[model samples]
Structure formats: structure tokens, C-alpha cells
Target: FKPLEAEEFRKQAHRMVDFIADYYKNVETYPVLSEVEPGYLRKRIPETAPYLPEPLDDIMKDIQKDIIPGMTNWMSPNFYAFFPATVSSAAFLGEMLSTALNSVGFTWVSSPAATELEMIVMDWLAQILKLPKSFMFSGTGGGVIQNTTSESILCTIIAARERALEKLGPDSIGKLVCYGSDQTHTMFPKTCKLAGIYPNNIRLIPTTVETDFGISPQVLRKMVEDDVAAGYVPLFLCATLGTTSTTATDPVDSLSEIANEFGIWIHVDAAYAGSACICPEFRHYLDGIERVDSLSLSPHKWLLAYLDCTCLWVKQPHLLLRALTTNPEYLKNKQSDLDKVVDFKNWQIATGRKFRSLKLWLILRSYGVVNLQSHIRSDVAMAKMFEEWVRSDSRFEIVVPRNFSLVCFRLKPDVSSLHVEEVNKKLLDMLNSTGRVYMTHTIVGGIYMLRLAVGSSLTEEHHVRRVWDLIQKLTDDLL
Candidate 1:
């Protein structure tokens, strides 16, 4: 049995705080990506595990010297390669407290508080986000935790395929089909491969830049009709509220109306933009979400809560279980089929789950719904500031137009700005590699554009001014 020594534990805690806290405070001083060369990583990690246990202080010292340098700080003010994966102080402290508790939420009995907390918190978010009553299992539908929208998408799509296959019978798996935004996240393809759906069977519904690259319901209807005429069952239609390429929003009300007629499972993916809906100004994007069979959104992404805490609500939770469920005698109990217990393991693709809702609960408690709305409203304010700066500059233009905090813009200096993709791609590489700041790129209408996501914890008016100055100073070199 392991024994704990209080004094040693206190010292170790203090050491860890000092090491991580110092880095968090000074993360911006480092480059966004390391220029430490190809052979650098090979030299850093040891080839074999240490046979002897090192002193706590020695381990902490080595972590500072070796591991810290290699970490690309996602929390850095400059990190803009992906969506806002920022962590808050409240989230950090909650994580520490949760580790102290170390509750596993496989079954309600395994950790009663953890299971109940997740259920209550999911309802809390659903209420604040103005989601319909159809998503509540206590009423009709229910919610569960997932690691990312990718995983949730896979589960929802696969479940829909399973439900469709039952009607199509045992011999017609190859004829089952699904649809997505042509501006789809790459995960849809990867999921199709794993779920045994042929690549050709998935439809990329047409999207044009005029609609800002979200799936067009008109085009989607035609595609589904055309596929059905060709003897394929259009089983699922995935509507993305916020496309990762530019946070482009699809018209859910329109799509759901059309999807209902086709008897398709409409899964709405509002992973990034969903949090913005907390503010009354942005909630209209999900106006028709009441009709969705499944809804997946990530609190961890734009909510600034914590990482890997995506919550998905399904109108029929058992639909998911039917596709991926497996029962073992060792894991069964009297309470299993009573319907009073919420065995979370039965909800998703993964059997083992963590107490992720504790972090969600802490975030919501620390900052009430009113304050969370205020935080989202404030980011919208910051993005508007950046928008004016973009429009003022003649060399740069707003790419997909600003929706919430993500302002897609780039340098396009001439009528003869040939090879725009190569130009913006190179510019992004230069900017990110410089490490003073970082930004990402996207392609829309065959033109490459840079995405300026203004949601960093350290971002303020002055930081944006510095970014403007740096952009002005550097783009001339590219020309």
C-alpha cells in the first residue's frame, strides 16, 4: 500500500506551482513554434525508463529544463492555429481539486455525485443556451460527455446508419449513405473509414462562397434526391452551425424542415459557435435545433471552461447504445435495467469515462450564467475592434466576413494577385514560425485567407495594436 507524507507532498505541490505558474505568466516571450532543429527532440527524451526513483525536486528540475521547452503552449496569447483551446484559472483550480477527488463515473454507484453533477450541469447549459425541451431525457432526449466534436460526430453518424440499416435489412449496408457540408471538417471522412461506410457513399453537399461556405439546403435537397433516385438511402444529414474553416453558420431551421420530410437524422454540430449563443444576440443560429435528433456542442472550446469537455444530447439515447452497446455478466447488476440509474458507460462509444462534468460545474458555478454571457459578449466587442482595423487597411480584406469573434482576413494587394493560396500559406508559415504571434489559414472560393481568432485570455486593445504593427512591418518583406 502507498503511504502519503504530508510535508513532502506540500513541498512538491509548491514546486509544481512555481514551475507551471512561471511558465504561464511568461509564455508569450517564447516563439509559437520551436526553431530548435530536427535532431532536437531525439536528444531530449531518454531512450529507456529510469530504473530508480528520482528525488521529487530532481524530477521537477528536469521537467522545467527538458519538457517545458518542447510544449507548444496552447494557452499562449499567440496560439491561433486552431480554435480557441484556452483554459481559465477557474478551470485549472477545478482540475486540481478534481484530481484530489479522483472520481470515476462509469456507473451512478461508482460515483453518485459525479454522475448526478454531470446530469445537472448538462441541463444547466441546455437551459442557458436556450435548447429545446426535446433534448432532455427527463422529458424526451438526454445528454452525455465526449472528447471532441469528431468523436460525437462519429457516434451520431454511425448510430443513424445503424437505424437506417435496420429498415434497409441485412443485405444492404453498402447502399446506406450520409451527407455533410462541403466545408466539412476532415473528421467525417476518417469516421466513415472506421465505421465501414464506403467513401463514395458519403455526399459532400455543394456550398458556395456567397453563403459563406456552409451547406446549402437547396443543393443538399437536390443531392439527396439525386442519390435516392440512384437507389441509395440518404440516412443522415449533418448540419454544421460553425464550420472550422471560418466559423460559417448553416441555416438550421431551413435544413431541419427539409430533413424531416426525408426521415433523416439531423445532427447539428455547433461545437465552436454554440457558446456564443449564450448571449441573446447570437442564439438565433440555433433557432430550429429543437427538431434535431442529436445536438453536439463543446463547452471546452469557446466557453473557456476546460479542454475535452464536449456534451452531446440525443433525442434517442438508446439509438447510440444499439450501435455500440455490449453487455458483460461481470459488469451487470440489478440496477442496470431499472432505468433509475444513469450508467453513463451505455451512452457513448467509449465504455470508460471520466468525471468531466465536475469541471463544467465548477466553471458555471464560479461564473454564473449572466457572467458567462458577459464574457462571450466581451469577445464579440474585441472582434469588432479588430474588424475596423481590417477594413481600414487597403492591402487586406475581410475574407468570410466576421461572425462573433473570428475575423477571417488576409493581404491581397493586387488585381494580379496570382497564386493566392501559395502566398497566404507562406505568410501564415512565416507569422506562426516567428513566434511573436500566431494565426491560421483557410481557403474559400479558391482564395486563401488568414483567420484571426481574437479569444485569447491575454488579448486586449493594446495586444491587437501590436499585432497590427507586426503585420504591417512583416507583409512588406513577403512582397
Candidate 2:
């Protein structure tokens, strides 16, 4: 009667593996973006759960027929929308093992290996990125594995808020201000609001094409001064290493100085571009990282890890503990009382945390530094090639400098009498509708541009060339 029979589990697991293998082998055959309309899935299956157990074979068939078509196939080589949520064989296996073990490692006493491995892999990642000694456990600081950049940012904001309130008094929360550039991820303000920051106090410093959309340190200083003069407390500054719109990098060194002067905590949100910093050429992006209070990046985004793995490090872990720690009588234990081990529950918003670090560990071990760097270089080279092609074509213009592996370009107004933005939007729709390729758009300085992010683990030179050809053909049709 037990579902834990090893022989039965082995048979189903093998079938599941084959199913995934088949899907990967022919992922390109499907549309890169799903064509399903709203409520499409709701109409496909039963209104209520079945009373009896479903056979594995029947469920697998249903997944193939009903679910696969509705998915935006991020794994498809032709998917150029957004940053890569890349995956690898090693990451997949690691995720599988993590799910199997299902360790709720909220405390060291609960699972020592889970907590210990998380610390070890985080340190390894810090070393790989050449982060300052202060960001490693060997030094005074340490790292944690959060589920996403948003959660990590929220944790830091809470910690920073608590630390500031401790000095400024909690009643002054209304006057606490935070900062980021217009190009910063929307999550910054969202998380800030959740942490009790006033909406008006979240300053989105204006950026210009003149500065490649990076936040201006001079502008930031002026804003902070104005807020201070108004009796507002400057609490946090999020200096992005790669802004979402144009991949702009704020001046961490310059901004950190102002933040330090104002007694502000500076956090670097490098969710996408941080992975590339492992390469020697890209390491310069993190030149001023030593001054930052905290930083976070998603290994799931570019390092071949699967979804739900963001690494966050802090220069002062005690601040997080002070803000988020929860001690209950039921959960009380000697190890926790001794205060020798890290109970990760105190580092994040939630008490229950998955064994997420295992996937990062597997990814790092499987690819190693050299192969991982090579993977990044290959993607960058492909993007460089694409940028050159866009430049050579008189009808299209590269909207901004290609940074990392994302190229933002659009049709030139000289090529069409229609509004350039309208044409580009239509061009994107056409390209995505073809089912052969998919790319997303972003508007910077009022100019709509198509973003071609070339970081899918399966993408190749041919796919890039094919997408370029498709874009040209679609533009011709639109014109």
C-alpha cells in the first residue's frame, strides 16, 4: 500500500527522465512563445480534482498535449525575451535531489549539511566573483541563498530599515528615504514599500542617454542633500550593476561614498550581469563592490542554474539577524542557544528554506570556472556579432551600447514613414508571431527598441543568424 516502493519509483523516474529528454530534443519544434489566450488552460481540464489516483502514463500524456502548448518555451534556442533563466543537466539533477531530500533547513540543528553546504557554496561564489574579503564567512561577513532578487532586496531593506530606525527611532519611518535610478528593477520600490517606506520617499534618480542610462552620482548627492535638508533620513541606496532597460551600471564607488557620508546602506542589485563578472574582462563592473553593504545576483539567471536561486551577501550579518530573527519555544534548541551555528531562518523573510544551494554547487562543480567563463564569452561574442549586423543594416540602429549578452536595437525612422516606435512594436509582434523566434521590447528615452538577449544555454550562432534573418524579413514585410 506504500508509495515508497523502490522498484515502482525507479520505473516512473526513468519514464519521467525520458519524457524530459524528448521534450528537450524537440523543443525548437514548438513556438518560442505560447499562442494561448487567457483562460485557455482553465477550459482544458476537469473543474475539480479527481477522486481516484491518475495513472502516470495518462498524466504524462495530458501534460504533453495540454500543458506543453501553453508554455512559453524559455528553453527554446530562439527565446530572446528577458534575461535567461538558464538551466543545465547538472542543475536539473541537483534540483531533483533537493526535491527528493526535501530538507527544511531553517536551522543548523535541523540539517547541518544543508546549512553548511549553503555557506560553503556561497563562499565559493564570492571567490569566483572576486568579491571583497568582507563578503565571505572567512571575514566578518557572509552570504545566504534566497529564492529571488526581490526577496533578497526585501531582506536587506528590512535590515537596513531596522538598523537605521534603531539609531533614528522607529517613529521616524515616514521620513526614511531610499534611492535608485529610473532604470532600476521595479522590485526595488516594491520591496521598499513592503518594508514600510513611503512611496514618495523612494527616489528614482533620472538617467540620460548621455550617461548610458547609469545613475548619476552627482545627481544622487544633490537629491540626498535635499532630502536631508528637508529632515528626511536617507536610509538605503540601490546601485545597480546592470539596470534592466539598457544594462546600465551605476557608479558604485562614487555612490557608496555619498551613502557612507549620509549613513545609508548601499546594496548592489546585479541579478543578471554579475554572472558575467567571473570573466576577467567583466570583473571591472565590480570594482567598487568592497564599499557596498550588500549585493545579490541570481545564479538561475545566467550561471546555468535552474529557477529559484539567488545569492545574497552582506557585510554585516548581525543586522539581518536583528531585523528578521524569530525564536519560538517549540523551535528552541541547544545549538541555537549556543549561538555558534547559523540558523538561516534569521537571514530571510521566511523560516522554511529549500536546499537551493545544492543546485549552485552542482552548477559550479560541473562547469568549473574555465568552462563557465567560456560560456559567457561565447554568448557575448554572439551578441557582438548581432550588434555588427544591426549596424551594417541601414534600416536598423543599435539603440544602446551592447553590454553583457543583451543587444537593444530598433528600426531606423529613415526606413519607414510610420512612427519609429510603432514600426518597432509591430516588427516585434511580427517576429514573435512567426513561431520561429521571439524577442521583447523596451522603451528607453522614448525610443522603442527590441532586446535580443543571447544567453540561452541552447542558443548557437545559427540561431542568432536565423533570428536576424527573420527580423529583416519581418521588417521588409512591415515596410
Give the best candidate by TM-score: 2
Cα lDDT tens digits, model 1, 248-359, are 8889999998888888888988888888888888889888888778888888888876777898998776677766564555223322243644878877776677778878
lDDT of 2 at 368: 92
- Per-candidate clash tally: 3, 0
lDDT to native, each model: 0.79, 0.88
Error of 1 at 286 (Å): 0.4
Question: Distance (Å) between predicted and true CA of 452, model 2?
Answer: 0.2
Error of 2 at 415 (Å): 0.8
Cα lDDT, model 1, residue 193: 65
TM-score of each: 0.93, 0.96
Q: Which parts of model 2 are misplaced by more than 4 Å? A: 326-340
Residue-level lDDT tens digits of model 2 in 1-479: 69788898888899889989998999999998998899998898999999999987889888999999999999999998899788899999999999999999999999999999999998999999999889988767899999899989999999999887877788989999999888974778888889999989888999999889998889999999999899998999998988777788888888888888888899999999999999999998888788889999988998898988899999988777777854554224322233446889888887898888888889889989999999989999999999999999988888889888999998888888888888888998899899988888898888889999898988999999988888888888886
* All models, RMSD in angstroms: 2.9, 2.6
